[PDB]
Design a protein around this nucleic acid. Sequence first.
DNA 1: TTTTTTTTT
Lengths: 208, 244, 287, 82, 541, 114
Amino acid sequence: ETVQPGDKCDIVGTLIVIPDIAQLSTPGLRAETSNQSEGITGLKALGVRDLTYKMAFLACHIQQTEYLDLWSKMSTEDRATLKKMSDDKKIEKNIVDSLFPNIYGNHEVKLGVLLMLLGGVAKKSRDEGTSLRGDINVCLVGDPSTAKSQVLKAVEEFSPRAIYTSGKASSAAGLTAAVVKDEESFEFVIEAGALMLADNGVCCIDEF
Amino acid sequence: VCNEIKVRISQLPVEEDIRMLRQVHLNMLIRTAGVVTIASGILPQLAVVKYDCVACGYLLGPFVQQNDEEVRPTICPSCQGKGPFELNVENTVYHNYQRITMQESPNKVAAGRLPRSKDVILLGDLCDSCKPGDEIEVTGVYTNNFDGSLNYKQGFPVFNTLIHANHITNKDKMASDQLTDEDIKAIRELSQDPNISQRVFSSIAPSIYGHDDVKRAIALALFRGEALRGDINVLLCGDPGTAK
Amino acid sequence: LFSAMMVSEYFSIKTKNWTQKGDVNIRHLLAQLGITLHETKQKFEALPTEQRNLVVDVLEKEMDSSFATFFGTLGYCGKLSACDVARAVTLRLEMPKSETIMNRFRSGQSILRSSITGERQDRLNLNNTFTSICQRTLQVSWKTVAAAINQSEIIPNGPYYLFSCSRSIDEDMVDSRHFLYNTAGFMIRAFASMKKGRTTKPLIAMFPLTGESAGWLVVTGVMPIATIYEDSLLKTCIGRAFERVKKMTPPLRIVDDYFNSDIIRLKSEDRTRFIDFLQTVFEGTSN
Amino acid sequence: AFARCFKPKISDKAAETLVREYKKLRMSDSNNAATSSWRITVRQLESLVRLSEALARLHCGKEVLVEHVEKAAELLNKSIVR
Amino acid sequence: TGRELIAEYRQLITQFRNFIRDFSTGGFGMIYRDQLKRNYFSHEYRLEINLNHLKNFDEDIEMKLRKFPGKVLPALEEAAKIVADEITTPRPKGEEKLHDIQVTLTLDEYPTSLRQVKSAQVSQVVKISGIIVAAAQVRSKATKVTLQCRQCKHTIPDVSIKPGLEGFALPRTCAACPIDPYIMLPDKCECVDYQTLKLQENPEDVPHGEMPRHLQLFTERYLTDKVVPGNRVTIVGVYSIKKGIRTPYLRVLGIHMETFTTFTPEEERMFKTLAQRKDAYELIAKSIAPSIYGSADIKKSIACLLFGGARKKLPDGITRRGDINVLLLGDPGTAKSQLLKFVEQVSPIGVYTSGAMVLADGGVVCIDEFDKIHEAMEQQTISIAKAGITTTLNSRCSVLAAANSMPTILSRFDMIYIVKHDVLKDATLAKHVIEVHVNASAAKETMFDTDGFLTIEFLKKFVTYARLNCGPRLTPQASEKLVNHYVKMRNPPITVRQLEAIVRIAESIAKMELQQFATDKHVEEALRLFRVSTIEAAATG
Amino acid sequence: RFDVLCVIRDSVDSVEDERLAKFVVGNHRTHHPDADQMDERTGVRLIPQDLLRKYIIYAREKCHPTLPEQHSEKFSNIFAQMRKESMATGSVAITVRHVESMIRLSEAHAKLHL
DNA sequence: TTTTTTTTT
Ligand SMILES: Nc1ncnc2c1ncn2[C@@H]1O[C@H](COP(=O)(O)OP(=O)(O)NP(=O)(O)O)[C@@H](O)[C@H]1O
Ligand SMILES: [Mg+2]
Ligand SMILES: [Zn+2]
Ligand SMILES: [Zn+2]
């Protein structure tokens, strides 16, 4: 449980082969196929049945590929550079001109999307259970060839947890979260869709 | 009245998430919390069993019913042989049984994760004590058992796990609608004053300013006509943002 | 047994069940005596005989009274008690007042004859009489006393206490001597148990009538609790007090036709002058 | 990534400025009630507070100042006008 | 140790025989003996016993019967069989066979809550109350069976099966031959009826904000087909677990229920007295809906709708309809729905609603909100041909319709009204109606009614009497007027549909007087009603 | 099916905008995670909320108002006046349902004073 | 379960 859906990871380990263990009968276990493309034949436990195999990776190590105490801990280089950035009085222009270098004009749209990346402070009522939403929502409408898809693609490239979708190639199951059932197991399970993989992040919908 | 007094134990100091239980906690006492999603009906389960010996009429037992077994004898000692067996209707004992499913609270889940869930078993006077949707807190023993079909499902010798409940607190139990003599004296002293109608009307929703017609309609609708519908029905229509 | 206990005078005064704590008090009392709630709340016929004898012994020792009575048995039919048959006959004789006097007499005669036979229809009539009006009369009397205490209807008025209603709960029962005597005797002791010093005055009670007797009141009274009787005879003087109120001038609209002198009918308008005249009589005997 | 750990509070002059700017927005919409392309309700104040908090997070400020409310109102007006 | 159980069993049979013979209410009244004799000669092989009478006779066997019913109850049934043989011998020739008798029980106690049956009460007698929610078809269960071995053909006869929802296991190997060799003969076994029911707890006893719970019931022989869904019942039975977890069910031992076309000479004389009265038609029209003011011609029309015309079939096979149909138009108020509810209550068969058209063969349907079928009205049939189905549904009824306003379907209705400046008369009506509602608030605080109007229970019976008995025709002199009226109106929208509607109304008026024939009087009143109703639509809209 | 209908119309105003804005900003400013009373219009005392709940619970189950016959004279005349004015206006009529609603409201108002 | 296609209302 050190990793979540939507993460991108490096794994170190070994490649292994696992059998179809339901075909065998031994003391303590009879075969599930008897209770309820050609394989290997000959074993005492395989009376008439046959055995086949699947690949699997046996992980030895997994990791993802990429507050005052934390501020103290990022001590020399990060505090120097970030404090100079915080002192910069034209940081709004200097950030938007680096986030969107290929787009001319549209200063209002650039600033609004930059504020959407930061967002407000979410607050909970102390006993009612109600809450005040801190997330910001932005919509773009305009004529053909006005760089709407360019802006959305740039946001999804920059942000760490952002996802891009098209409205013509999506379903209500795949957009946010979905129900699935297993066939290794047989119980029902939940798939985290694109909105939940972009939880605490940005979901971009083109051709809404 | 009874045969045995049970001891329930509360305020155990260490809490665990459902998400964080490991093989360390097997056969240990733990406390968790969550939301009920599914509950079965109440059913009787075998507790203590005795059997007849068909060969000589001797009564075999008692056998305390274990958790996951079909307990039976094999030899009757009074005839020293493997006589046939029947269930003794007259001396078998039962108790109530229920099974529920509990999920992690949505408030406590971190970023982008899915909540986990466990099954909980209730026996005796713990049955029928909660509904789906209730925020509850459970104290019990965390245990494991083998399941060959679960082994065949996962492809590895995994084990099924459960919690046997020992104490429950339901956080969503409403307050008791019972009044003390002090409360009834306060109600009488309030009712004696002449300005009581305007007190009630204006003191409903004190943050909202004006709209005394809506306030009086709500106030007279909280009380009821005597009855032949006795209920007084109210409808509001208004522009968005008008605090309706 | 639970419903039988909760309307009696003794257990109501002991547990104060017109207040909020009554249910807790009776549950603790049953736990002390050693009787289970299920035993009290199932029907008394359903218990086994030894269990019945044990429970009756415990409650007899708790109530601590010298009462004894007669029992009649006939064949394999159920045993009856003379006290229970007396209550059934009384309530078929005296109620409702809208029926004619000969019909009420014949009804009481039929109920009395039903107790000395084993016939199914007769015993069914007797059990219906037990399980409707005999229960309902006790419940209405208890409700009257509880409402009186909880809403403070009883006031001092000089040398006596006065009780008056806004409405009577059931006007068919108000004109019965059994109802009036039992309710007033319960009410004075319930009122005197709440606070000290209330034992030395009589109580006067008034009930209103509506319909064909609209504008009339039924009036009766009970002697003080602290009175000492020189022997067992239970002498009273409140009917004599009402009778001497009637002789005063200018006259009042009093009806005095009953064979019992301590029950009268009074016009609603003459209530104030009646209160003043009765106070004059009790003060003139105090002098 | 660093700036989103900040949780700025609302200062007194910022609260006064929020009241004044909400009044300005609703007044101008009422002056152009038959011709404005989009209505103004209570929800715009929620959006204004969110934009002010985001600007405070951009400048790493520990409190919302007057300037954050002013520039949030300016950006909101420039988005609205149609 | 089987001889000890035999001694116990024969002792129980002796005691139950003594109970059935000796219990008495005094005198020569041995009630169970007399009831058993009367049932046996009525060919009902059953008996019913009160457990409190049994407790007074002997407490011990009653206590044993409650706590061990599966052991003790067959002894009681056997004792009943023995006593019946003693009572009825010597039986006549052809009746020598001794029958088998079912014993049922009653018990006077408070019922147990269905949520509060303790687990200690398994295999004990309990009393439960509830509502029957479902009832399955009757099926057969085997009581005694004959077994035969597959290979060597050795037999085991009269193997008896225990009651309830219990199976039984066959012998594993031959008694005189592989694994499981015995088979069951279909021809040499005994069978009895059984039925399964489902019981719901009473909605009064459900705790606040919860759904009711359910229990399954098993019934046998004379206790089958006694109940229908919706019935309220109290049941005495054994609490059983169905064959470490099991589901429960109740095996029923006793059920207690908690709940036209035939006339007397008194009823016939009452009907004929009303028919002999001169003001009978006006009296019935006044008796329709007395709580609603005015509307005299509309009430007369509703009386004509209730009684209807005659129904005819000529030698060529073409039938002629007897039903009559009425439509109401105008403002949505003025107690139209209350009039429809009154007709629903008074009619011998009928339905109120906003398919539904089918369900009233010989009855009356009231349709509210009609602005929401032409084949149904004229042909008394609807038809369909969609993908993969073609059928016709046929049913005969009269229709009363209320609208709030197609010109096409107006041809299908015999009478039409427009209900439509009341305020001065409405002041007196407001005084009367508000006095009625304040008197209803004060209330909140058998031919005739007290006010001279006819009662519903008499009116419904009288309509059901008249429909099956009157069947009138027209006189020739009555027929002569309609021809001249038709020709004059048509040659000064006149159609044969309207002519036949007028004929039906005249027959309907003559039906109420219990006449052999209709005359010029009934024709003239029918013409007045037709003009007053129909010409409103010609004048308006 | 509704005894009472109500309209809540929007209106632009400096004073109501100020009261609403100050209330909402106060809600944010106090719900940040680390961060005898009388009515204005009348001076009339408020009731504590749980005591008002207990008041309603007692009044529902321990009080049952009676209705004497004499008030029919007021209800009937006012109904006849209202219905006559509505029908003469040529509008939606006032009917017997409104008499029912008036009786229900009077009973509830009696229950308020117990 | 969810997804994709062709006939029917
Ligand atoms: N302000 C701009 N600066 C630079 N390139 C621009 C600008 N506006 C439009 N373009 C160009 O317009 C082309 C279309 O961009 P695109 O992202 O598809 O806009 P769009 O509005 O989403 N088109 P469409 O999806 O059909 O509505 C690209 O080649 C962009 O480089
Ligand atoms: Mg694009
Ligand atoms: Zn043995
Ligand atoms: Zn064989």
